[PDB]
Amino acid sequence: METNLFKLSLDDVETPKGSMLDLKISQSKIALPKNTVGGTILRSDLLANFLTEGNFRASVDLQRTHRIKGMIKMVATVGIPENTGIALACAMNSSIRGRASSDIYTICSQDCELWNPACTKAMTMSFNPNPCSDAWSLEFLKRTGFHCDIICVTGWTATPMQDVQVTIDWFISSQECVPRTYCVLNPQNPFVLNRWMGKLTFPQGTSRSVKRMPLSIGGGAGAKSAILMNMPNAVLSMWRYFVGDLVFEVSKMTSPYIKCTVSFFIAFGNLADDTINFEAFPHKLVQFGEIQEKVVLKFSQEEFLTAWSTQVRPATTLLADGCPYLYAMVHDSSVSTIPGDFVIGVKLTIIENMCAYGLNPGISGSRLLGTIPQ
Amino acid sequence: QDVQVTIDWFISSQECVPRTYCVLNPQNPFVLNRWMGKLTFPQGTSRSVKRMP
Amino acid sequence: SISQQTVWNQMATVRTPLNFDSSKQSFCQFSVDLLGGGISVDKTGDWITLVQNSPISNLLRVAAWKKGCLMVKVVMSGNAAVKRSDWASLVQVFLTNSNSTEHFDACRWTKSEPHSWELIFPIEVCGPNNGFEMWSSEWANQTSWHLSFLVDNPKQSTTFDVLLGISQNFEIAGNTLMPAFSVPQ
RNA sequence: GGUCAAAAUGC
RNA sequence: GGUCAAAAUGC
RNA sequence: GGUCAAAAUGC
């Protein structure tokens, strides 16, 4: 008539499996006050504090399970009409050491995604918090500093009628965690860099409103009296000279109602803004579909002859750069029927088929990178 | 200004098929078609929760 | 791989208090957190410290997970008006993972070379993730690498310069989200 | 490269 | 009849 | 289930 406790199944060390419902760990509601200006920290905390925000089916499983060999899945949601737009981002970095920066340079290297709710009414990011292995723990997330920053990069185009709320659904995924380590002296391929290369703003009118971006990319971001930094750059700067194929990601952050055809090419800084003749250069013309927000741009390694310098002193006059630049131009005009400024953000996602000849002793600080209102 | 809906009426190429109801021996799928409500959600961040019997 | 010879890069430059009263003792004391990026100092004086916003210095401050071998170099540039028959200074160097008295020393060097000395040695970062370590994290009551110093007649053995170099096998992963580094002038 | 999206619906 | 117990352990 | 939509255009 007796029961053996020993042969009871109370000692199962396994990763939660189930339906997207069953594997729901939390529900965070984030607030998007209609007077939001851009560069605004909507909520910066600890992941573990983000996940511990509701009692949902695998919630205790998150807390009373020591090894989770699956992935944190976010599902965000806020709908905004087509005559306005906000540019939000979820940045997950691996630790915070103090009163840290919440730019976008500084918070987009590990795993972060930008989205204009007017175009993308529901985003889903998945990440692996221990970039070094295949499992995580809540206590890990807790006692290590895993951070989640939710910021506005380019504020409202049109100010909505009342406040808004972004609801992020958090879950554990059905897919395994895969590492992403960096050997600093023997890079991989494709090398993951993820660099905010700039927030390009084109005013309304018939101005070629030509934006030039340095292709020298070590030290990182400039600050008044300081340098801003993210690992994927830290390491790059460990090298001296570089080449490869540069893959850029152009995102629209303004309201699908602000129109422009933007022309991208590759040149040098010695050219005047009135150079009729550039479009006689390899160039690619970009145009955004109403609800289209991401154009991926690929420049091949054949657009560069010789490797270039990883760093160039900050004063080096647009007449002395011997390093290739990434020029963006208005091929037509900026046109709208509502006040607004066309804003598109550029992020260097991966350098593919890289070649790094060298080792950089260093050069003090770096130059500035675009930003501004809304 | 004002608007006008123009309805075009026609006789169709397709046959008429009955739909009768036995009240004590329903069919399947039973056709009910019931206005279960006009749910109105004001602008803002209100869970503006609507419950229907 | 990716390599170049004799290209090391700067991290530390510690200078000794000028105001030092050879009366409340003979020595001055200081430490460098190699894997953290912080110079901790005495209350002996007004110390002049600088950490260099180097490719590496820069890198180690930002990279949350560290596995591998780094190369260190400490150089003593001293007071050269002091006549070599008149030298009274040693400088005791230590290598620990905590700034605790209860922790024990890894390596221990003591150098007493007039006006200048050099010291080249390997440090290796071994940790609990997959062999990866995080700066003084509570996770596996984790630690670092510290290079502390003790200067006797600090008016003589005046300046200290710390350089490190990287190993073909240094691997990082993750971003320790850090404030803006301050750049002089 | 990861992520993501996609390879579509009804009884 | 249900339940339960049982058809056993170690690297 | 009905309805509806759809399985697409040009000489």
Side-chain angles (χ1 to χ4, degrees):
Chain A
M1 215 207 122
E2 243 202 73
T3 287
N4 208 311
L5 267 359
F6 252 102
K7 164 132 200 213
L8 240 64
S9 310
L10 310 165
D11 76 298
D12 174 345
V13 308
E14 235 147 327
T15 186
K17 141 192 203 174
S19 143
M20 228 179 188
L21 206 111
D22 294 318
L23 267 114
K24 199 152 129 125
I25 72 173
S26 45
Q27 193 176 80
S28 335
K29 253 162 163 181
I30 294 207
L32 248 179
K34 100 220 245 197
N35 260 251
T36 263
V37 300
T40 324
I41 336 219
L42 260 79
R43 170 167 191 199
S44 216
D45 203 0
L46 261 111
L47 199 43
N49 266 209
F50 260 111
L51 305 158
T52 274
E53 235 178 357
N55 212 52
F56 285 100
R57 296 233 170 173
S59 289
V60 353
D61 257 64
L62 181 66
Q63 312 213 239
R64 261 79 176 151
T65 280
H66 300 319
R67 214 165 129 114
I68 319 203
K69 94 210 260 186
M71 260 168 164
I72 311 230
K73 198 183 228 229
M74 146 172 105
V75 201
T77 270
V78 69
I80 172 191
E82 261 155 62
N83 22 190
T84 186
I86 193 92
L88 287 96
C90 205
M92 249 102 180
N93 263 252
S94 230
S95 194
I96 247 217
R97 207 174 135 186
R99 179 193 178 170
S101 172
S102 326
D103 193 65
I104 150 89
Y105 169 53
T106 344
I107 105 187
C108 49
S109 12
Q110 236 190 288
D111 300 87
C112 116
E113 217 92 28
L114 215 106
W115 89 92
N116 185 318
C119 305
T120 281
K121 33 157 159 66
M123 173 239 190
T124 338
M125 173 176 100
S126 294
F127 52 120
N128 173 250
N130 197 150
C132 319
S133 165
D134 38 27
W136 50 279
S137 239
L138 185 58
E139 277 273 340
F140 184 81
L141 239 18
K142 265 168 170 228
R143 318 185 95 151
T144 293
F146 215 89
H147 225 244
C148 194
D149 275 46
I150 302 116
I151 94 179
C152 161
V153 206
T154 244
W156 293 107
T157 314
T159 166
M161 239 63 177
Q162 246 143 236
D163 287 324
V164 166
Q165 180 173 105
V166 175
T167 272
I168 292 189
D169 267 336
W170 297 104
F171 306 90
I172 275 143
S173 189
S174 255
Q175 269 142 247
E176 233 153 12
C177 298
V178 176
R180 141 146 125 272
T181 114
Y182 282 82
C183 204
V184 179
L185 232 26
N186 190 188
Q188 192 144 170
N189 179 49
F191 182 62
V192 167
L193 177 95
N194 304 289
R195 217 235 192 224
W196 197 242
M197 264 264 208
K199 179 200 200 212
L200 283 81
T201 156
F202 301 80
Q204 256 172 67
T206 136
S207 210
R208 219 141 98 151
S209 253
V210 159
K211 273 59 195 171
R212 296 187 258 249
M213 327 200 216
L215 257 197
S216 353
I217 18 156
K224 186 152 170 183
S225 290
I227 92 161
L228 259 45
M229 201 97 178
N230 99 206
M231 161 174 171
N233 218 172
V235 8
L236 202 94
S237 288
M238 262 308 221
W239 318 326
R240 155 81 222 210
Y241 292 113
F242 102 95
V243 231
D245 331 299
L246 312 200
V247 159
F248 295 88
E249 188 173 278
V250 191
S251 321
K252 102 173 176 206
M253 318 170 125
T254 238
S255 177
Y257 264 56
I258 302 180
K259 304 194 158 78
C260 185
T261 296
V262 154
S263 189
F264 290 86
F265 55 81
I266 307 253
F268 282 84
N270 349 342
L271 314 160
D273 286 355
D274 27 274
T275 311
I276 316 204
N277 178 280
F278 317 120
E279 290 217 0
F281 248 149
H283 68 255
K284 35 190 123 243
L285 313 146
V286 212
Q287 257 186 95
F288 285 114
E290 263 257 340
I291 247 171
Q292 198 187 28
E293 138 196 24
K294 215 143 100 185
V295 176
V296 152
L297 259 16
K298 176 116 165 255
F299 296 83
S300 169
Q301 182 177 161
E302 269 172 345
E303 226 142 292
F304 312 97
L305 181 132
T306 273
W308 60 103
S309 263
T310 253
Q311 251 186 302
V312 171
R313 14 201 135 114
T316 273
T317 43
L318 229 72
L319 261 89
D321 226 8
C323 298
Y325 272 94
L326 201 244
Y327 278 82
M329 230 159 28
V330 195
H331 169 74
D332 350 347
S333 330
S334 206
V335 22
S336 226
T337 57
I338 59 143
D341 216 51
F342 189 77
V343 198
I344 68 101
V346 187
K347 177 179 180 181
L348 203 111
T349 241
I350 54 172
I351 337 220
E352 248 174 356
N353 260 121
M354 209 183 192
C355 205
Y357 306 99
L359 236 60
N360 190 254
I363 306 166
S364 219
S366 83
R367 33 202 188 182
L368 270 195
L369 207 100
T371 181
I372 193 179
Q374 129 208 219
Chain B
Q1 246 143 236
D2 287 324
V3 166
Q4 180 173 105
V5 175
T6 272
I7 292 189
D8 267 336
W9 297 104
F10 306 90
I11 275 143
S12 189
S13 255
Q14 269 142 247
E15 233 153 12
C16 298
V17 176
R19 141 146 125 272
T20 114
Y21 282 82
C22 204
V23 179
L24 232 26
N25 190 188
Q27 192 144 170
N28 179 49
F30 182 62
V31 167
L32 177 95
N33 304 289
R34 217 235 192 224
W35 197 242
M36 264 264 208
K38 179 200 200 212
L39 283 81
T40 156
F41 301 80
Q43 256 172 67
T45 136
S46 210
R47 219 141 98 151
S48 253
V49 159
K50 273 59 195 171
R51 296 187 258 249
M52 327 200 216
Chain C
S1 180
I2 277 177
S3 77
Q4 200 148 21
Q5 277 210 288
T6 327
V7 10
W8 300 72
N9 35 119
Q10 260 171 150
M11 170 179 197
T13 272
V14 163
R15 231 218 158 260
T16 319
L18 278 62
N19 22 107
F20 191 66
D21 243 13
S22 186
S23 216
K24 41 112 216 230
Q25 223 74 254
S26 112
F27 57 89
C28 105
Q29 235 161 174
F30 88 104
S31 230
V32 164
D33 177 339
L34 268 47
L35 287 182
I39 343 199
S40 202
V41 337
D42 241 333
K43 168 173 190 183
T44 313
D46 279 299
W47 285 79
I48 293 175
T49 82
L50 192 49
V51 173
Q52 268 114 119
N53 293 330
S54 259
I56 189 168
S57 169
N58 261 174
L59 161 103
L60 302 163
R61 303 195 243 188
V62 172
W65 284 113
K66 315 188 233 311
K67 184 201 233 180
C69 309
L70 293 173
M71 215 58 136
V72 161
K73 233 245 250 219
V74 209
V75 189
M76 205 267 292
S77 306
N79 184 351
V82 173
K83 276 196 178 186
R84 200 207 222 248
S85 38
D86 283 355
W87 195 254
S89 164
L90 85 78
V91 51
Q92 263 171 326
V93 202
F94 306 111
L95 191 101
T96 313
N97 22 219
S98 198
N99 264 135
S100 236
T101 178
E102 348 200 9
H103 260 69
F104 287 119
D105 279 337
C107 217
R108 231 193 188 74
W109 306 259
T110 312
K111 287 231 139 220
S112 21
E113 253 127 313
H115 316 149
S116 94
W117 50 257
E118 199 175 289
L119 169 66
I120 322 249
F121 70 82
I123 80 171
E124 190 194 352
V125 193
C126 297
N129 222 200
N130 191 98
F132 281 72
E133 185 162 62
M134 204 166 110
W135 188 76
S136 315
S137 192
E138 221 166 87
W139 184 230
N141 279 171
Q142 265 164 89
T143 225
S144 240
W145 282 135
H146 279 85
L147 185 65
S148 328
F149 296 79
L150 201 113
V151 207
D152 235 306
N153 205 340
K155 251 172 178 180
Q156 247 163 6
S157 272
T158 63
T159 312
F160 294 123
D161 250 302
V162 176
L163 317 127
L164 2 118
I166 183 153
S167 183
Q168 233 94 178
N169 79 274
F170 200 82
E171 145 165 290
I172 79 199
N175 193 76
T176 298
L177 229 206
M178 300 278 315
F181 300 139
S182 205
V183 174
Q185 277 145 224

